[PDB]
Amino acid sequence: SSLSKHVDEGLDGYRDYLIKYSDRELVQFFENAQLKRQYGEETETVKRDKDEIEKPSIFALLPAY
Amino acid sequence: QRNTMSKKELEVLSQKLRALMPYADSVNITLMDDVTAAGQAEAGLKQQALPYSRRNHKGGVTFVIQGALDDVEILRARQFVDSYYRTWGGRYVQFAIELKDDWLKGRSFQYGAEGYIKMSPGHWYFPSPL
Amino acid sequence: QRNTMSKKELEVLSQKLRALMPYADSVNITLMDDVTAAGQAEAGLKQQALPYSRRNHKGGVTFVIQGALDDVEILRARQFVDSYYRTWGGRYVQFAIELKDDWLKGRSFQYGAEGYIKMSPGHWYFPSP
Amino acid sequence: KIPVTGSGFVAKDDSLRTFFDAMALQLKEPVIVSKMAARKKITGNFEFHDPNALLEKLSLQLGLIWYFDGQAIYIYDASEMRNAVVSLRNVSLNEFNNFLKRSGLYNKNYPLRGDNRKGTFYVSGPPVYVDMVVNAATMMDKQN
Amino acid sequence: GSGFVAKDDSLRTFFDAMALQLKEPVIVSKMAARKKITGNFEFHDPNALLEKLSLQLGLIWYFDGQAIYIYDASEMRNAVVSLRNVSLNEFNNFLKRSGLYNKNYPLRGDNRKGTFYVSGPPVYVDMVVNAATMMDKQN
Amino acid sequence: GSGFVAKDDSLRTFFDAMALQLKEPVIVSKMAARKKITGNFEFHDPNALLEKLSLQLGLIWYFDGQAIYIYDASEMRNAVVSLRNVSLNEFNNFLKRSGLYNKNYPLRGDNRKGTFYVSGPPVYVDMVVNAATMMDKQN
């Protein structure tokens, strides 16, 4: 809870390396299947236009890379 | 109930229409009442069990028949209008039968003076008050 | 309201214009108001419901018609402009129809005092009007 | 370039964070929208002339809870409201309400439920309101 | 003048539309968010519409003063607690003045004793047990 | 006069160009460096342009006397800290006499007590908390 927000500051270069070389159409699949898994079937589908300011998680880049 | 002509100048119209129609020997002009032209159009539109909406305004009325009618309510509403046009003309009362689908086609909404359409479980649209 | 010729200076202009057209008998010169020439052009431009902007200056006016007009608005604009040019000519008032494309088609924007166009969830555009 | 005569905000599929940051000038404080309440979208022609009354109505039609702590405006959705119950060994509830009223953190929409001169009460609301009330209540008894 | 037209909603879409006529926000659980509803409704008396719908659909609801929690009926929990040095009448007098007294789910027990029984929604039972055990430790 | 014609800059090449009219360096964080801006800007009143653009973009800023820090609004943190043996009205005179007193984010609390509530930028909160627990250690 508290050490996970400390390791987030320590893990910005690896997330930026995984973003540059993973696929855009495949990270969006692992992002929507995670939201469909956690909250339910009535969850709004995430589209491409999040990519400007919102960053994907480390559990969606790592299978898609 | 919509003209202001006296007895003298109605003979001028009954002679300028006779000179305009050469086969006619004489033209007879009868003054018909105005509320019996719309009460017969409403009573005939009620016997066929059709949904309608009368719009009264100054100098003419208009009956609007909309919705998703079925196959018998189109034939029964087309046989009455063409039997009414033969006797009254399309000058005073106008029938507006329009076949259109379910408005707000599959959307849930909260109508009345503060309206919003629900495009999705997480999406709100705020048009004119539905 | 733009020339100050006298009676004799108008009569020598009529006698020096009659010599140029040999078929004519006499040239008749009438003076018209300068206000109704630019008034009929605006009263006809408001009736067709076209967006416009008027730029008054000395010695002529000009009307600018911008925007992403649709198909029927540039048919009514040609039918009015080519019917005004037949009556008055293009020496005083001139129309300038230029058509462009709309930036705010799928965009969300704020209008009013401090206007901006949000081109993206992470992009702002501050225009200078 | 932007031809409309009046003043207002037009949102085409804005996602409730870009929408409330546009209200963050008429409101004179910055707005902080949470992560779960930013998945909802809103579209339409809006105008702001008393946004503290507009935020209350849209927080009930959309389903949201909000809180203003003097520097910013926090916005969560309704399913993030948490509850707590704490006991004061040596100060009263009427003593704690004077600390909240004098400082300026007293919120009349989420009051404190309890007996007027006792030690126990029940607080519930947004997570930045509860985690301040619990932390100051257990940091005044250790001082006293 | 008002009203919702439900077409296959999910009881979280539905009850937020009633959250304006009711002056409090509504929190629907995730097991009671699976049931669905259709129909043309009319929100002119919502405190009786919520009571009629919670018995036809099968639900339990609790309003503490800030929000309206809605659970389905299979989430009802129960517990028995014993108080050492305070009786039931002063704890019920605490709830009558604190405004947390719910007449639909009262406290079952002897009127001047320590042991009693409580059952209701999981936000009401978890508050009543913690408030009951946090007064005897204070005494 | 002067100005800056921004064409798809990234809020770090913009606020460095404003950092000449502002007479201090500008430190933009990397979560507020992903937003972009474009347009012809004229710097003739920078202290009101930064105040207006922080609300139109959604930002928080702070000037401690040597530099101007700029974060986005979702990085604002808060804390409540207890002073055992020093009043708030004395600590607030320490901030007024030093130069770190910011009237946009003041200290909410009782005027003669030990507990208060502070919120603002992370460089202002982590200075006020550390200089308050280093004033309980001195007494």
Side-chain angles (χ1 to χ4, degrees), chain E residues 48-67:
Chain E
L49 189 74
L50 176 57
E51 184 54 281
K52 189 250 286 181
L53 266 295
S54 55
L55 292 168
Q56 292 171 327
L57 263 54
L59 295 172
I60 43 177
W61 62 283
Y62 176 66
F63 160 66
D64 50 315
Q66 293 91 346

Side-chain angles (χ1 to χ4, degrees), chain C residues 24-42:
Chain C
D25 296 6
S26 81
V27 188
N28 171 234
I29 292 174
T30 80
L31 282 88
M32 288 177 317
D33 291 331
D34 194 76
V35 185
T36 76
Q40 285 186 353
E42 198 179 351

Side-chain angles (χ1 to χ4, degrees), chain F residues 42-131:
Chain F
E42 190 166 21
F43 307 133
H44 59 263
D45 181 21
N47 285 300
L49 182 60
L50 180 51
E51 184 72 61
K52 194 168 64 54
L53 277 190
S54 314
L55 296 180
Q56 290 182 330
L57 280 77
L59 293 175
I60 52 173
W61 63 287
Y62 178 63
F63 161 64
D64 59 330
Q66 291 95 336
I68 299 180
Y69 296 82
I70 286 169
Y71 312 93
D72 71 317
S74 67
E75 280 174 328
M76 168 183 290
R77 41 189 288 206
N78 54 334
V80 44
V81 64
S82 159
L83 297 179
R84 193 65 75 219
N85 42 6
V86 52
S87 87
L88 180 52
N89 199 29
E90 174 165 29
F91 179 74
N92 202 254
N93 285 24
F94 162 72
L95 299 188
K96 287 172 178 290
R97 220 200 296 261
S98 87
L100 310 158
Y101 183 58
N102 194 17
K103 82 168 190 301
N104 275 298
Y105 314 107
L107 286 86
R108 306 283 168 191
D110 200 68
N111 218 27
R112 67 284 187 196
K113 262 313 174 177
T115 320
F116 52 89
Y117 175 75
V118 66
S119 78
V123 75
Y124 174 63
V125 176
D126 280 357
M127 178 259 297
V128 160
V129 167
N130 269 323

Side-chain angles (χ1 to χ4, degrees), chain D residues 27-43:
Chain D
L27 302 163
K28 295 174 175 64
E29 306 306 312
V31 189
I32 304 175
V33 190
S34 88
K35 193 248 185 184
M36 201 201 282
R39 307 200 193 116
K40 320 185 163 185
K41 302 160 185 318
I42 183 163
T43 174

Side-chain angles (χ1 to χ4, degrees), chain B residues 82-93:
Chain B
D82 281 357
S83 158
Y84 188 83
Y85 187 84
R86 206 228 65 87
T87 178
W88 281 103
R91 187 63 72 98
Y92 187 64
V93 42

Side-chain angles (χ1 to χ4, degrees), chain D residues 111-130:
Chain D
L112 288 82
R113 305 286 178 188
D115 199 4
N116 219 15
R117 32 173 77 91
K118 289 293 178 67
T120 45
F121 54 88
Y122 175 80
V123 60
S124 87
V128 78
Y129 176 65
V130 181

